[PDB]
PDB file of all heavy atoms in Angstrom:
ATOM      1  N   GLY A1426     111.871 126.319  83.351  1.00  0.00           N
ATOM      2  CA  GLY A1426     112.359 126.740  84.643  1.00  0.00           C
ATOM      3  C   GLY A1426     111.664 126.086  85.842  1.00  0.00           C
ATOM      4  O   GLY A1426     111.945 126.460  86.960  1.00  0.00           O
ATOM      5  N   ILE A1427     110.807 125.107  85.602  1.00  0.00           N
ATOM      6  CA  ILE A1427     110.087 124.454  86.686  1.00  0.00           C
ATOM      7  C   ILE A1427     111.000 123.490  87.427  1.00  0.00           C
ATOM      8  O   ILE A1427     111.704 122.689  86.793  1.00  0.00           O
ATOM      9  CB  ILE A1427     108.867 123.725  86.115  1.00  0.00           C
ATOM     10  CG1 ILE A1427     107.911 124.720  85.458  1.00  0.00           C
ATOM     11  CG2 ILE A1427     108.146 122.970  87.269  1.00  0.00           C
ATOM     12  CD1 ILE A1427     106.783 124.082  84.635  1.00  0.00           C
ATOM     13  N   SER A1428     110.949 123.583  88.747  1.00  0.00           N
ATOM     14  CA  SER A1428     111.693 122.647  89.609  1.00  0.00           C
ATOM     15  C   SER A1428     111.183 121.229  89.413  1.00  0.00           C
ATOM     16  O   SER A1428     109.986 120.965  89.475  1.00  0.00           O
ATOM     17  CB  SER A1428     111.484 123.074  91.088  1.00  0.00           C
ATOM     18  OG  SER A1428     112.076 122.123  91.952  1.00  0.00           O
ATOM     19  N   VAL A1429     112.120 120.322  89.162  1.00  0.00           N
ATOM     20  CA  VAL A1429     111.872 118.872  89.047  1.00  0.00           C
ATOM     21  C   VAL A1429     112.710 118.178  90.090  1.00  0.00           C
ATOM     22  O   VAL A1429     113.953 118.187  90.020  1.00  0.00           O
ATOM     23  CB  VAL A1429     112.114 118.342  87.643  1.00  0.00           C
ATOM     24  CG1 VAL A1429     111.896 116.848  87.603  1.00  0.00           C
ATOM     25  CG2 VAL A1429     111.253 119.083  86.621  1.00  0.00           C
ATOM     26  N   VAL A1430     112.050 117.588  91.081  1.00  0.00           N
ATOM     27  CA  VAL A1430     112.710 116.911  92.228  1.00  0.00           C
ATOM     28  C   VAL A1430     112.036 115.557  92.415  1.00  0.00           C
ATOM     29  O   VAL A1430     111.077 115.202  91.737  1.00  0.00           O
ATOM     30  CB  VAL A1430     112.654 117.753  93.510  1.00  0.00           C
ATOM     31  CG1 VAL A1430     113.301 119.140  93.287  1.00  0.00           C
ATOM     32  CG2 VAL A1430     111.219 117.869  94.010  1.00  0.00           C
ATOM     33  N   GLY A1431     112.544 114.789  93.378  1.00  0.00           N
ATOM     34  CA  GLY A1431     111.967 113.538  93.713  1.00  0.00           C
ATOM     35  C   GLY A1431     111.583 113.424  95.174  1.00  0.00           C
ATOM     36  O   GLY A1431     111.694 114.380  95.928  1.00  0.00           O
ATOM     37  N   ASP A1432     111.158 112.224  95.581  1.00  0.00           N
ATOM     38  CA  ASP A1432     110.693 112.045  96.951  1.00  0.00           C
ATOM     39  C   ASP A1432     111.811 112.222  97.966  1.00  0.00           C
ATOM     40  O   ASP A1432     111.571 112.625  99.100  1.00  0.00           O
ATOM     41  CB  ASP A1432     110.002 110.685  97.138  1.00  0.00           C
ATOM     42  CG  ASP A1432     110.923 109.465  96.893  1.00  0.00           C
ATOM     43  OD1 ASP A1432     111.912 109.578  96.171  1.00  0.00           O
ATOM     44  OD2 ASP A1432     110.601 108.378  97.433  1.00  0.00           O
ATOM     45  N   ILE A1433     113.055 111.904  97.580  1.00  0.00           N
ATOM     46  CA  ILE A1433     114.185 112.102  98.513  1.00  0.00           C
ATOM     47  C   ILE A1433     114.350 113.569  98.810  1.00  0.00           C
ATOM     48  O   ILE A1433     114.647 113.956  99.959  1.00  0.00           O
ATOM     49  CB  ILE A1433     115.459 111.458  97.965  1.00  0.00           C
ATOM     50  CG1 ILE A1433     115.190 109.996  97.563  1.00  0.00           C
ATOM     51  CG2 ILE A1433     116.611 111.631  98.965  1.00  0.00           C
ATOM     52  CD1 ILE A1433     114.751 109.124  98.725  1.00  0.00           C
ATOM     53  N   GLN A1434     114.152 114.470  97.828  1.00  0.00           N
ATOM     54  CA  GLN A1434     114.227 115.888  98.072  1.00  0.00           C
ATOM     55  C   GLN A1434     113.170 116.317  99.069  1.00  0.00           C
ATOM     56  O   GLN A1434     113.408 117.143  99.940  1.00  0.00           O
ATOM     57  CB  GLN A1434     114.063 116.698  96.801  1.00  0.00           C
ATOM     58  CG  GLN A1434     114.622 118.107  96.930  1.00  0.00           C
ATOM     59  CD  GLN A1434     116.121 118.069  96.993  1.00  0.00           C
ATOM     60  OE1 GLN A1434     116.781 117.370  96.228  1.00  0.00           O
ATOM     61  NE2 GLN A1434     116.677 118.839  97.939  1.00  0.00           N
ATOM     62  N   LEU A1435     111.949 115.815  98.888  1.00  0.00           N
ATOM     63  CA  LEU A1435     110.852 116.121  99.840  1.00  0.00           C
ATOM     64  C   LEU A1435     111.203 115.694 101.256  1.00  0.00           C
ATOM     65  O   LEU A1435     110.917 116.407 102.188  1.00  0.00           O
ATOM     66  CB  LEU A1435     109.569 115.453  99.381  1.00  0.00           C
ATOM     67  CG  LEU A1435     108.957 115.958  98.059  1.00  0.00           C
ATOM     68  CD1 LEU A1435     107.606 115.292  97.860  1.00  0.00           C
ATOM     69  CD2 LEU A1435     108.829 117.455  98.025  1.00  0.00           C
ATOM     70  N   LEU A1436     111.786 114.507 101.376  1.00  0.00           N
ATOM     71  CA  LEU A1436     112.229 114.011 102.688  1.00  0.00           C
ATOM     72  C   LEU A1436     113.276 114.927 103.292  1.00  0.00           C
ATOM     73  O   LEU A1436     113.191 115.294 104.495  1.00  0.00           O
ATOM     74  CB  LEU A1436     112.770 112.605 102.542  1.00  0.00           C
ATOM     75  CG  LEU A1436     113.396 112.008 103.833  1.00  0.00           C
ATOM     76  CD1 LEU A1436     112.391 111.785 104.916  1.00  0.00           C
ATOM     77  CD2 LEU A1436     114.050 110.682 103.455  1.00  0.00           C
ATOM     78  N   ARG A1437     114.250 115.370 102.512  1.00  0.00           N
ATOM     79  CA  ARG A1437     115.354 116.166 103.043  1.00  0.00           C
ATOM     80  C   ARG A1437     114.851 117.527 103.545  1.00  0.00           C
ATOM     81  O   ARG A1437     115.312 118.039 104.576  1.00  0.00           O
ATOM     82  CB  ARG A1437     116.433 116.350 101.997  1.00  0.00           C
ATOM     83  CG  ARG A1437     117.475 117.387 102.347  1.00  0.00           C
ATOM     84  CD  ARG A1437     118.500 116.899 103.360  1.00  0.00           C
ATOM     85  NE  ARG A1437     118.004 116.586 104.709  1.00  0.00           N
ATOM     86  CZ  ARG A1437     118.742 115.903 105.596  1.00  0.00           C
ATOM     87  NH1 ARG A1437     119.961 115.520 105.323  1.00  0.00           N
ATOM     88  NH2 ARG A1437     118.234 115.606 106.801  1.00  0.00           N
ATOM     89  N   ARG A1438     113.898 118.151 102.845  1.00  0.00           N
ATOM     90  CA  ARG A1438     113.280 119.393 103.274  1.00  0.00           C
ATOM     91  C   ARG A1438     112.529 119.217 104.566  1.00  0.00           C
ATOM     92  O   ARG A1438     112.377 120.172 105.352  1.00  0.00           O
ATOM     93  CB  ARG A1438     112.319 119.912 102.220  1.00  0.00           C
ATOM     94  CG  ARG A1438     112.963 120.280 100.928  1.00  0.00           C
ATOM     95  CD  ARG A1438     111.891 120.603  99.927  1.00  0.00           C
ATOM     96  NE  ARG A1438     112.449 120.978  98.635  1.00  0.00           N
ATOM     97  CZ  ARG A1438     111.724 121.072  97.531  1.00  0.00           C
ATOM     98  NH1 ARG A1438     110.404 120.888  97.541  1.00  0.00           N
ATOM     99  NH2 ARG A1438     112.346 121.332  96.394  1.00  0.00           N
ATOM    100  N   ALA A1439     111.996 118.006 104.834  1.00  0.00           N
ATOM    101  CA  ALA A1439     111.086 117.788 105.945  1.00  0.00           C
ATOM    102  C   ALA A1439     111.757 117.500 107.270  1.00  0.00           C
ATOM    103  O   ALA A1439     111.114 117.584 108.307  1.00  0.00           O
ATOM    104  CB  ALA A1439     110.125 116.632 105.631  1.00  0.00           C
ATOM    105  N   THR A1440     113.065 117.155 107.266  1.00  0.00           N
ATOM    106  CA  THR A1440     113.685 116.747 108.516  1.00  0.00           C
ATOM    107  C   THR A1440     115.169 117.017 108.456  1.00  0.00           C
ATOM    108  O   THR A1440     115.807 116.887 107.401  1.00  0.00           O
ATOM    109  CB  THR A1440     113.442 115.262 108.803  1.00  0.00           C
ATOM    110  OG1 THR A1440     114.041 114.952 110.082  1.00  0.00           O
ATOM    111  CG2 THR A1440     114.016 114.384 107.716  1.00  0.00           C
ATOM    112  N   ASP A1441     115.754 117.347 109.595  1.00  0.00           N
ATOM    113  CA  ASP A1441     117.193 117.522 109.683  1.00  0.00           C
ATOM    114  C   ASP A1441     117.867 116.317 110.321  1.00  0.00           C
ATOM    115  O   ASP A1441     119.062 116.360 110.612  1.00  0.00           O
ATOM    116  CB  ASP A1441     117.518 118.811 110.473  1.00  0.00           C
ATOM    117  CG  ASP A1441     117.240 120.066 109.672  1.00  0.00           C
ATOM    118  OD1 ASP A1441     117.454 120.031 108.438  1.00  0.00           O
ATOM    119  OD2 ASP A1441     116.851 121.080 110.270  1.00  0.00           O
ATOM    120  N   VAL A1442     117.087 115.233 110.567  1.00  0.00           N
ATOM    121  CA  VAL A1442     117.608 114.027 111.156  1.00  0.00           C
ATOM    122  C   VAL A1442     118.824 113.531 110.363  1.00  0.00           C
ATOM    123  O   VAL A1442     118.836 113.641 109.117  1.00  0.00           O
ATOM    124  CB  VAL A1442     116.509 112.946 111.217  1.00  0.00           C
ATOM    125  CG1 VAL A1442     116.115 112.600 109.835  1.00  0.00           C
ATOM    126  CG2 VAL A1442     116.983 111.675 111.892  1.00  0.00           C
ATOM    127  N   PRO A1443     119.863 113.062 111.037  1.00  0.00           N
ATOM    128  CA  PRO A1443     121.034 112.562 110.283  1.00  0.00           C
ATOM    129  C   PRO A1443     120.667 111.401 109.349  1.00  0.00           C
ATOM    130  O   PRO A1443     119.961 110.485 109.715  1.00  0.00           O
ATOM    131  CB  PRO A1443     121.966 112.080 111.395  1.00  0.00           C
ATOM    132  CG  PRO A1443     121.583 112.859 112.585  1.00  0.00           C
ATOM    133  CD  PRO A1443     120.105 113.122 112.472  1.00  0.00           C
ATOM    134  N   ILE A1444     121.256 111.464 108.136  1.00  0.00           N
ATOM    135  CA  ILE A1444     121.033 110.480 107.093  1.00  0.00           C
ATOM    136  C   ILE A1444     122.341 109.749 106.831  1.00  0.00           C
ATOM    137  O   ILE A1444     123.355 110.403 106.558  1.00  0.00           O
ATOM    138  CB  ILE A1444     120.557 111.129 105.803  1.00  0.00           C
ATOM    139  CG1 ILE A1444     119.160 111.718 105.984  1.00  0.00           C
ATOM    140  CG2 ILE A1444     120.549 110.070 104.643  1.00  0.00           C
ATOM    141  CD1 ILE A1444     118.639 112.418 104.747  1.00  0.00           C
ATOM    142  N   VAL A1445     122.308 108.420 106.893  1.00  0.00           N
ATOM    143  CA  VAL A1445     123.350 107.562 106.320  1.00  0.00           C
ATOM    144  C   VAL A1445     122.894 107.223 104.906  1.00  0.00           C
ATOM    145  O   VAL A1445     121.843 106.636 104.750  1.00  0.00           O
ATOM    146  CB  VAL A1445     123.535 106.280 107.145  1.00  0.00           C
ATOM    147  CG1 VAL A1445     124.472 105.313 106.412  1.00  0.00           C
ATOM    148  CG2 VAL A1445     124.013 106.546 108.590  1.00  0.00           C
ATOM    149  N   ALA A1446     123.647 107.670 103.890  1.00  0.00           N
ATOM    150  CA  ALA A1446     123.207 107.540 102.512  1.00  0.00           C
ATOM    151  C   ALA A1446     124.131 106.574 101.777  1.00  0.00           C
ATOM    152  O   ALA A1446     125.349 106.715 101.795  1.00  0.00           O
ATOM    153  CB  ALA A1446     123.230 108.881 101.814  1.00  0.00           C
ATOM    154  N   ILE A1447     123.521 105.581 101.133  1.00  0.00           N
ATOM    155  CA  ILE A1447     124.261 104.475 100.501  1.00  0.00           C
ATOM    156  C   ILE A1447     123.767 104.352  99.049  1.00  0.00           C
ATOM    157  O   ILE A1447     122.588 104.234  98.816  1.00  0.00           O
ATOM    158  CB  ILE A1447     124.008 103.142 101.245  1.00  0.00           C
ATOM    159  CG1 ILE A1447     124.523 103.221 102.653  1.00  0.00           C
ATOM    160  CG2 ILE A1447     124.593 101.991 100.440  1.00  0.00           C
ATOM    161  CD1 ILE A1447     123.833 102.262 103.567  1.00  0.00           C
ATOM    162  N   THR A1448     124.722 104.314  98.139  1.00  0.00           N
ATOM    163  CA  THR A1448     124.360 103.976  96.762  1.00  0.00           C
ATOM    164  C   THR A1448     125.418 103.015  96.200  1.00  0.00           C
ATOM    165  O   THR A1448     126.362 102.668  96.875  1.00  0.00           O
ATOM    166  CB  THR A1448     124.182 105.203  95.905  1.00  0.00           C
ATOM    167  OG1 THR A1448     123.530 104.848  94.662  1.00  0.00           O
ATOM    168  CG2 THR A1448     125.505 105.940  95.632  1.00  0.00           C
ATOM    169  N   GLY A1449     125.193 102.580  94.966  1.00  0.00           N
ATOM    170  CA  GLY A1449     126.090 101.659  94.310  1.00  0.00           C
ATOM    171  C   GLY A1449     125.370 100.488  93.696  1.00  0.00           C
ATOM    172  O   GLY A1449     124.228 100.673  93.230  1.00  0.00           O
ATOM    173  N   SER A1450     125.971  99.306  93.673  1.00  0.00           N
ATOM    174  CA  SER A1450     125.397  98.133  93.013  1.00  0.00           C
ATOM    175  C   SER A1450     124.490  97.316  93.953  1.00  0.00           C
ATOM    176  O   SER A1450     123.697  97.882  94.683  1.00  0.00           O
ATOM    177  CB  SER A1450     126.527  97.259  92.464  1.00  0.00           C
ATOM    178  OG  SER A1450     127.445  96.874  93.486  1.00  0.00           O
ATOM    179  N   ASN A1451     124.595  95.992  93.870  1.00  0.00           N
ATOM    180  CA  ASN A1451     123.718  95.111  94.687  1.00  0.00           C
ATOM    181  C   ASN A1451     124.416  94.713  96.007  1.00  0.00           C
ATOM    182  O   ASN A1451     123.726  94.189  96.893  1.00  0.00           O
ATOM    183  CB  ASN A1451     123.368  93.860  93.901  1.00  0.00           C
ATOM    184  N   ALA A1452     125.701  94.976  96.142  1.00  0.00           N
ATOM    185  CA  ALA A1452     126.353  94.860  97.458  1.00  0.00           C
ATOM    186  C   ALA A1452     125.695  95.758  98.470  1.00  0.00           C
ATOM    187  O   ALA A1452     125.880  95.592  99.669  1.00  0.00           O
ATOM    188  CB  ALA A1452     127.829  95.226  97.349  1.00  0.00           C
ATOM    189  N   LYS A1453     124.938  96.767  98.021  1.00  0.00           N
ATOM    190  CA  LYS A1453     124.498  97.784  98.923  1.00  0.00           C
ATOM    191  C   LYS A1453     123.385  97.266  99.866  1.00  0.00           C
ATOM    192  O   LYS A1453     123.216  97.787 100.954  1.00  0.00           O
ATOM    193  CB  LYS A1453     124.063  99.048  98.174  1.00  0.00           C
ATOM    194  CG  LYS A1453     122.794  98.998  97.370  1.00  0.00           C
ATOM    195  CD  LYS A1453     122.685 100.349  96.621  1.00  0.00           C
ATOM    196  CE  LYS A1453     121.489 100.411  95.695  1.00  0.00           C
ATOM    197  NZ  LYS A1453     121.661  99.566  94.456  1.00  0.00           N
ATOM    198  N   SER A1454     122.649  96.204  99.496  1.00  0.00           N
ATOM    199  CA  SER A1454     121.599  95.731 100.342  1.00  0.00           C
ATOM    200  C   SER A1454     122.133  95.153 101.654  1.00  0.00           C
ATOM    201  O   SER A1454     121.564  95.391 102.704  1.00  0.00           O
ATOM    202  CB  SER A1454     120.723  94.697  99.600  1.00  0.00           C
ATOM    203  OG  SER A1454     119.870  95.365  98.693  1.00  0.00           O
ATOM    204  N   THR A1455     123.252  94.382 101.579  1.00  0.00           N
ATOM    205  CA  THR A1455     123.854  93.918 102.839  1.00  0.00           C
ATOM    206  C   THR A1455     124.312  95.083 103.724  1.00  0.00           C
ATOM    207  O   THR A1455     124.063  95.044 104.938  1.00  0.00           O
ATOM    208  CB  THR A1455     125.041  93.004 102.559  1.00  0.00           C
ATOM    209  OG1 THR A1455     124.598  91.820 101.902  1.00  0.00           O
ATOM    210  CG2 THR A1455     125.694  92.595 103.907  1.00  0.00           C
ATOM    211  N   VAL A1456     125.013  96.077 103.168  1.00  0.00           N
ATOM    212  CA  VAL A1456     125.460  97.206 103.989  1.00  0.00           C
ATOM    213  C   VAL A1456     124.284  97.954 104.598  1.00  0.00           C
ATOM    214  O   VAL A1456     124.265  98.263 105.751  1.00  0.00           O
ATOM    215  CB  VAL A1456     126.374  98.095 103.170  1.00  0.00           C
ATOM    216  CG1 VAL A1456     126.627  99.409 103.913  1.00  0.00           C
ATOM    217  CG2 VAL A1456     127.696  97.382 102.857  1.00  0.00           C
ATOM    218  N   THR A1457     123.250  98.201 103.782  1.00  0.00           N
ATOM    219  CA  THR A1457     122.084  98.953 104.257  1.00  0.00           C
ATOM    220  C   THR A1457     121.464  98.261 105.468  1.00  0.00           C
ATOM    221  O   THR A1457     121.215  98.873 106.506  1.00  0.00           O
ATOM    222  CB  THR A1457     121.067  99.056 103.126  1.00  0.00           C
ATOM    223  OG1 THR A1457     121.680  99.786 102.059  1.00  0.00           O
ATOM    224  CG2 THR A1457     119.829  99.810 103.600  1.00  0.00           C
ATOM    225  N   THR A1458     121.308  96.972 105.374  1.00  0.00           N
ATOM    226  CA  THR A1458     120.697  96.196 106.463  1.00  0.00           C
ATOM    227  C   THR A1458     121.587  96.220 107.670  1.00  0.00           C
ATOM    228  O   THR A1458     121.157  96.429 108.825  1.00  0.00           O
ATOM    229  CB  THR A1458     120.431  94.758 106.013  1.00  0.00           C
ATOM    230  OG1 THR A1458     119.473  94.712 104.950  1.00  0.00           O
ATOM    231  CG2 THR A1458     119.869  93.937 107.180  1.00  0.00           C
ATOM    232  N   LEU A1459     122.897  95.929 107.473  1.00  0.00           N
ATOM    233  CA  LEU A1459     123.792  95.789 108.616  1.00  0.00           C
ATOM    234  C   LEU A1459     124.024  97.107 109.344  1.00  0.00           C
ATOM    235  O   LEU A1459     124.045  97.125 110.597  1.00  0.00           O
ATOM    236  CB  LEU A1459     125.115  95.165 108.122  1.00  0.00           C
ATOM    237  CG  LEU A1459     126.224  95.031 109.181  1.00  0.00           C
ATOM    238  CD1 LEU A1459     125.716  94.237 110.370  1.00  0.00           C
ATOM    239  CD2 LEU A1459     127.413  94.306 108.485  1.00  0.00           C
ATOM    240  N   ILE A1460     124.171  98.229 108.638  1.00  0.00           N
ATOM    241  CA  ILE A1460     124.370  99.479 109.399  1.00  0.00           C
ATOM    242  C   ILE A1460     123.069  99.851 110.114  1.00  0.00           C
ATOM    243  O   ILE A1460     123.145 100.368 111.250  1.00  0.00           O
ATOM    244  CB  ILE A1460     124.852 100.638 108.479  1.00  0.00           C
ATOM    245  CG1 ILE A1460     125.183 101.891 109.296  1.00  0.00           C
ATOM    246  CG2 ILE A1460     123.798 101.017 107.383  1.00  0.00           C
ATOM    247  CD1 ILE A1460     126.269 101.660 110.392  1.00  0.00           C
ATOM    248  N   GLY A1461     121.923  99.547 109.536  1.00  0.00           N
ATOM    249  CA  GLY A1461     120.673  99.722 110.282  1.00  0.00           C
ATOM    250  C   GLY A1461     120.646  98.939 111.568  1.00  0.00           C
ATOM    251  O   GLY A1461     120.310  99.470 112.633  1.00  0.00           O
ATOM    252  N   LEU A1462     121.047  97.674 111.518  1.00  0.00           N
ATOM    253  CA  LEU A1462     121.091  96.839 112.719  1.00  0.00           C
ATOM    254  C   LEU A1462     122.117  97.387 113.704  1.00  0.00           C
ATOM    255  O   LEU A1462     121.846  97.410 114.941  1.00  0.00           O
ATOM    256  CB  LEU A1462     121.444  95.400 112.323  1.00  0.00           C
ATOM    257  CG  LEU A1462     120.326  94.596 111.712  1.00  0.00           C
ATOM    258  CD1 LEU A1462     120.901  93.235 111.239  1.00  0.00           C
ATOM    259  CD2 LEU A1462     119.234  94.352 112.771  1.00  0.00           C
ATOM    260  N   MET A1463     123.314  97.790 113.244  1.00  0.00           N
ATOM    261  CA  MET A1463     124.320  98.339 114.123  1.00  0.00           C
ATOM    262  C   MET A1463     123.741  99.531 114.895  1.00  0.00           C
ATOM    263  O   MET A1463     123.928  99.643 116.111  1.00  0.00           O
ATOM    264  CB  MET A1463     125.563  98.757 113.366  1.00  0.00           C
ATOM    265  CG  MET A1463     126.395  97.556 112.938  1.00  0.00           C
ATOM    266  SD  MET A1463     127.850  98.285 112.142  1.00  0.00           S
ATOM    267  CE  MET A1463     128.801  96.787 111.847  1.00  0.00           C
ATOM    268  N   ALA A1464     123.061 100.407 114.181  1.00  0.00           N
ATOM    269  CA  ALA A1464     122.538 101.626 114.800  1.00  0.00           C
ATOM    270  C   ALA A1464     121.439 101.293 115.813  1.00  0.00           C
ATOM    271  O   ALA A1464     121.395 101.862 116.905  1.00  0.00           O
ATOM    272  CB  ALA A1464     121.997 102.584 113.734  1.00  0.00           C
ATOM    273  N   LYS A1465     120.546 100.383 115.448  1.00  0.00           N
ATOM    274  CA  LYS A1465     119.496  99.961 116.360  1.00  0.00           C
ATOM    275  C   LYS A1465     120.078  99.363 117.622  1.00  0.00           C
ATOM    276  O   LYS A1465     119.672  99.697 118.739  1.00  0.00           O
ATOM    277  CB  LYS A1465     118.559  98.972 115.666  1.00  0.00           C
ATOM    278  N   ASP A1466     121.076  98.471 117.431  1.00  0.00           N
ATOM    279  CA  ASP A1466     121.694  97.813 118.584  1.00  0.00           C
ATOM    280  C   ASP A1466     122.398  98.790 119.483  1.00  0.00           C
ATOM    281  O   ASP A1466     122.511  98.534 120.695  1.00  0.00           O
ATOM    282  CB  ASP A1466     122.684  96.750 118.086  1.00  0.00           C
ATOM    283  CG  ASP A1466     121.984  95.512 117.540  1.00  0.00           C
ATOM    284  OD1 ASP A1466     120.773  95.319 117.724  1.00  0.00           O
ATOM    285  OD2 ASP A1466     122.709  94.680 116.927  1.00  0.00           O
ATOM    286  N   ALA A1467     122.898  99.882 118.950  1.00  0.00           N
ATOM    287  CA  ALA A1467     123.552 100.925 119.704  1.00  0.00           C
ATOM    288  C   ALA A1467     122.552 101.812 120.435  1.00  0.00           C
ATOM    289  O   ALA A1467     122.987 102.718 121.151  1.00  0.00           O
ATOM    290  CB  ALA A1467     124.443 101.749 118.768  1.00  0.00           C
ATOM    291  N   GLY A1468     121.283 101.551 120.247  1.00  0.00           N
ATOM    292  CA  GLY A1468     120.236 102.265 120.975  1.00  0.00           C
ATOM    293  C   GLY A1468     119.565 103.362 120.201  1.00  0.00           C
ATOM    294  O   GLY A1468     118.804 104.134 120.828  1.00  0.00           O
ATOM    295  N   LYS A1469     119.798 103.474 118.895  1.00  0.00           N
ATOM    296  CA  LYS A1469     119.179 104.554 118.118  1.00  0.00           C
ATOM    297  C   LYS A1469     117.837 104.078 117.562  1.00  0.00           C
ATOM    298  O   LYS A1469     117.655 102.890 117.240  1.00  0.00           O
ATOM    299  CB  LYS A1469     120.096 104.972 116.976  1.00  0.00           C
ATOM    300  CG  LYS A1469     121.349 105.662 117.449  1.00  0.00           C
ATOM    301  CD  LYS A1469     122.162 106.200 116.291  1.00  0.00           C
ATOM    302  CE  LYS A1469     123.379 106.977 116.801  1.00  0.00           C
ATOM    303  NZ  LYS A1469     123.038 108.265 117.499  1.00  0.00           N
ATOM    304  N   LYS A1470     116.872 104.994 117.513  1.00  0.00           N
ATOM    305  CA  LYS A1470     115.635 104.755 116.799  1.00  0.00           C
ATOM    306  C   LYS A1470     115.862 104.982 115.316  1.00  0.00           C
ATOM    307  O   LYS A1470     115.966 106.141 114.855  1.00  0.00           O
ATOM    308  CB  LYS A1470     114.541 105.701 117.336  1.00  0.00           C
ATOM    309  CG  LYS A1470     113.185 105.463 116.792  1.00  0.00           C
ATOM    310  CD  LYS A1470     112.240 106.426 117.437  1.00  0.00           C
ATOM    311  CE  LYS A1470     110.785 106.087 117.136  1.00  0.00           C
ATOM    312  NZ  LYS A1470     109.931 107.232 117.549  1.00  0.00           N
ATOM    313  N   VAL A1471     115.963 103.910 114.549  1.00  0.00           N
ATOM    314  CA  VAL A1471     116.428 103.996 113.167  1.00  0.00           C
ATOM    315  C   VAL A1471     115.271 103.594 112.223  1.00  0.00           C
ATOM    316  O   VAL A1471     114.480 102.706 112.520  1.00  0.00           O
ATOM    317  CB  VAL A1471     117.620 103.062 112.923  1.00  0.00           C
ATOM    318  CG1 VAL A1471     118.279 103.326 111.577  1.00  0.00           C
ATOM    319  CG2 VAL A1471     118.626 103.204 114.056  1.00  0.00           C
ATOM    320  N   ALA A1472     115.206 104.324 111.099  1.00  0.00           N
ATOM    321  CA  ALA A1472     114.281 103.988 110.020  1.00  0.00           C
ATOM    322  C   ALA A1472     115.120 103.759 108.743  1.00  0.00           C
ATOM    323  O   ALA A1472     115.950 104.611 108.404  1.00  0.00           O
ATOM    324  CB  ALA A1472     113.214 105.039 109.834  1.00  0.00           C
TER     325      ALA A1472
END
């Protein structure tokens, strides 16, 4: 009955900041980078 979670669970408990969440194959690295840039360029402090 012990809870088994990962670091993403720890992150989600720690902040309510909006998350853009991406998964899939290797196409995902281009999308991850580009949406990050779009958000930064739009004036958001993005991590």
Side-chain angles (χ1 to χ4, degrees), residues 1426-1450 1452-1464 1466-1472:
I1427 299 169
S1428 174
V1429 177
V1430 303
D1432 63 336
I1433 308 301
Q1434 200 71 44
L1435 294 187
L1436 174 67
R1437 168 79 294 167
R1438 297 173 179 167
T1440 182
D1441 287 325
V1442 64
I1444 294 177
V1445 172
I1447 296 156
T1448 192
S1450 56
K1453 71 184 176 288
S1454 283
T1455 296
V1456 169
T1457 298
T1458 297
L1459 177 54
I1460 186 57
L1462 283 173
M1463 285 184 175
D1466 285 349
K1469 293 187 176 290
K1470 186 178 191 193
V1471 191

